[PDB]
Amino acid sequence: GGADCGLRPLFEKKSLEDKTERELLESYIIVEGSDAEIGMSPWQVMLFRKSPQELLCGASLISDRWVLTAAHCLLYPPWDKNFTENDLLVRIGKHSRTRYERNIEKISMLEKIYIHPRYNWRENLDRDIALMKLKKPVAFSDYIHPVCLPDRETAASLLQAGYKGRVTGWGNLKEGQPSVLQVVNLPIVERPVCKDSTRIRITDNMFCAGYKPDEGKRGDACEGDSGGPFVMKSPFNNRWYQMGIVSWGEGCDRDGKYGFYTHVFRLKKWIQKVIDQF
């Protein structure tokens, strides 16, 4: 599925708007977040561990058989993490964090994991992206629906400083755990400001988002949220597009610090290549 991407069954399809999407549209020219509405992010996936039944990361549904996530969720040698297909399972259609949502959520097994060949875990998590092929296709519903991958023009017009995006996840609320899916809308920040906030070498395959100390507002992703989607609603065709993947950050919601995200469009050719061969 991908022709009906980005149009949510409970919102766009019914001409209903969620509580905070107007905030995103008005800007076009999880710590400190809030509870998500039912069906607000039908592409949100939970990367789950089979051994100690645990939440590992967020992820996103891009088609009936493909899930997108951060490569650090699967491979991060500094912490002795190197997961294979059989160590994990994905839970799609969820709202509650801990509860097995009977008749609503669907669980899938991984058939193959693809990590970007030039993923730089040794230094700055450059090219922090990974694809996962589901063993069997998932059926869409009111709570399960894929998000769109951006094209050159969508990336060009939407990826601008000041424009707000949305991050969702079941991660930590502070640097305990939420009962349900959290959501926070954050503005994209100027590259110079991103660079000047850290000693880490940032590349073109990343972008940072968040409020500046003087802006008053707060918000950020945190542990448990990584691998999750950073999405924006296009004001041209009303579809939701995934512009970033929650990558890294120095702490959570720290003043003067910003969350970093994998630049999905710049790595799109790798995505297409993988899906077109496997």
Binding site: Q53, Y76, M109, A221, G224
Partner: peptide
């Protein structure tokens, strides 16, 4: 950064 659950019944794994 960097990277309570109810068990899952045998309806997948």
């Amino acid at each position: 950064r960097x990277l309570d659950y109810e068990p899952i019944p045998e309806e997948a794994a």
